[PDB]
Subunit: 239 residues, 4 copies
């Protein structure tokens, strides 16, 4: 097998194995603030940020035809000053090695429009806090699987626990082609899960970079934090 | 840290690191049939079986007061020739080192009655296929957490997909005390999850044996199979890496 | 894969996943004293003790014909009150599941005489502190690989650092059939290693228990401790 | 912990998680050829090549003062068409993130002259095939630990088995500060080991890249290949299960 793994049980203000894009930064306290937060903890609108692990991950192989299994865990908080006006959300994603931030707000930095496009070569699990009816978003905050489109191929309800840390596990099984995403809140004891088959071979290039992307709302007051506290990842591509 | 881990990607007819109790047996195709199945695949009633890893696991420590985190993963099939009449279920459990099967049917081999009692020292994640009203079972098939009682402290719905393989992950984080159980059907793409705080230190002994228990219905016709295809486990009692664990096997 | 692993970063007075045989006991400070040691830390003569992990391990498979790879590490101390007169030593071993101690002294609890016998079905890496010329022991304290006989199929010099902790790694790769054993003293910065091809399939049964065995001298004054501080083990048997 | 690991069970022509410097290339057969080899397998003189994992590794931390443990294994072959005339050798090394190849030949791509210099911030385990008396090289092919200097702090004898694959394990325990390097020939059943205390915190930056460096001789005829077949690495900087790291890792 070809394998890659890492663990950040915290982040550090100097973190050269993490490529930070847009407004993403690591605080002195070890938290990866994806979108802008001021000194009092107040999130800011019109914000887009991304963090990706610096080394490319081999996700499938042309000669053999085999695809990697992977698993990734992370712990994150979304705090909203007013839970009545929130946006836009965060996502864990795989994309080409040279990927740059796309459109912000509803596009979660990952897509440019409503339309499905094979050229994005982007698979993402989204944690979506704002309904874009333009994107067939469901009437509730939700988890979705985004395969070359911001119009999720599947979703499920996720009830946000304001300002509480959420623990996420995302897994992908090569043999079954099943992507599974689960979110638990230890404080509230609530838990949510989604599963769907996704063919990585037809969507991603052989080599990808993985990380996070998050956006705050375009309008004043539609603001929330996207704080990652910890992150671990492991892939295995069998020969 | 004290650590215990194992992986059975199949089972074997001769499997001395697994203690079989009741009707449980491994077939020559490597399937762990917890409950009686005849030669044609037809499950039998009045059945009870258990399988437990032979080595005791250190789940908490009185000198430190620390408790283990663990994770376990397994793949299992429940097949019912008639989906209108199914019973009683399977469970993954932690119990004292010397535990033996208790009562069958709706008690799942793990308890003797409806009543809660600390002396069981049993914590279990059930996949319960029959509504026992005197156990306060909900109106549907469900996953439940049982802490010294067959009356689950919490449950959620699980739609059994008849005859299809179900992948389970159960994890326990001693830092948050959160037990989480999830089940996914790759065939159907359905998925289910339950989470709850459980204090192992007050409810288990320091040393446990872990494994599976299953029962078929005490009425002729209320039958199904309880076939475990594979099982991995890892425990970590500090004086696991979970993404690396499911991935590693 | 069929896999078994465990780590004892120390030992406990109540340890039911360790089967203790002979004089072996765990102290209140978490030390596995394989052979008798009195209250002042003075080792005693005529002692023999073993500890094996309680779950049998699948080491090879009859249907596929495949053999397990394994790796084990442990930290141990041998303390002698008089390093002019020491015996007999200690060994890590694999043997049938129902194995019970055999003869003491230079037989290390693992064999009954000098002769080779396929019926032992035991493979051991010995750390031997007394020359039995009767066993072809080399003239120096040594590491040996014992395959169904106390006459090592191969040995190498091991210089005992009296009362200092030794870290051992023993690995078996099933693709190459190579058994490798190394020992290092962090205190003296000395290191020793031995390698040989060993066919486990033809010596061991499919299922084995693993652990340690040790013995002190038959003669008065020929005494040393055989204290194990920590031990970890991982096997992997592929389909 | 902050952890970084990878495994290359072979290499590929497109390998963007490796950084190739100097003459290093990977062949269609998946072999990392650190120094020039023509089409017939014949190594070429005057060659220097390196390969390093593309992600920086956190090796120690100035806030806590902790240093990482790490462990690495690799399989390599050195083939000389004339074992009487060989040079210069190869090395696994940790250096600053922006590090680039230094002087060639017996400097092994890692150092610029014989003298020690804290500015190198380089720690290496060399597999040295040519005696440079100016560097105090022992009169035999050897394993050595190089800490900011080509003159090893410690060495041990290593008898090159020409054309045969060598399996290396290098470990660093941060609690004891003991670096250990072992090398074994499965084909020959020979083995070699070296252990020393090295304080990483004083020699390396908090962040490093790690990899391989190799050089063939300056004079025609002093030539050998430096072919790496596989490489895995794991580090752990606490705020590794090594037996699990040999077995898998
Ligand atoms: Ca949205
Ligand atoms: Ca029931
Ligand atoms: Ca002897
Ligand atoms: Ca040299
Ligand atoms: Mn959405
Ligand atoms: Mn129930
Ligand atoms: Mn001997
Ligand atoms: Mn040298």
């Amino acid at each position: 097998a070809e394998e890659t793994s890492f663990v950040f049980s915290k982040f550090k203000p100097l973190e050269p194995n993490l490529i930070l894009q847009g407004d993403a930064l690591v605080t002195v306290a070890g938290v990866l603030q994806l979108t802008n937060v001021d000194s009092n903890g107040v999130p800011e609108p019109s914000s887009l940020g991304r963090a990706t692990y610096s080394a490319p991950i081999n996700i499938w192989d042309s000669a053999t035809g085999l695809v990697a299994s992977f698993a990734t865990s992370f712990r994150f908080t979304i705090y909203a000053p007013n839970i009545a006006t929130i946006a836009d959300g965060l996502a864990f994603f795989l994309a080409p090695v040279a990927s740059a931030p796309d459109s912000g707000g509803g596009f979660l930095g990952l897509f440019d429009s409503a339309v499905g496009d094979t050229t994005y070569q982007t698979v993402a699990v989204e944690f979506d806090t704002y309904e874009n009816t333009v994107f067939t978003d469901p009437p509730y905050t939700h988890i979705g699987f985004d395969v070359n489109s911001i119009s999720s191929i599947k979703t499920v309800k996720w009830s946000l626990a304001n300002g509480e840390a959420a623990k996420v596990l995302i897994t992908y099984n090569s043999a079954v082609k099943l992507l599974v995403a689960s979110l638990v809140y230890p404080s509230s004891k609530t838990s949510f899960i989604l599963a769907d088959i996704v063919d990585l071979s037809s969507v991603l290039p052989e080599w990808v970079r993985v990380g996070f992307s998050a956006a705050t709302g375009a309008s004043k007051g539609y603001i929330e934090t996207h704080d990652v506290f910890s992150w671990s990842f492991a892939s295995k591509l069998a020969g």
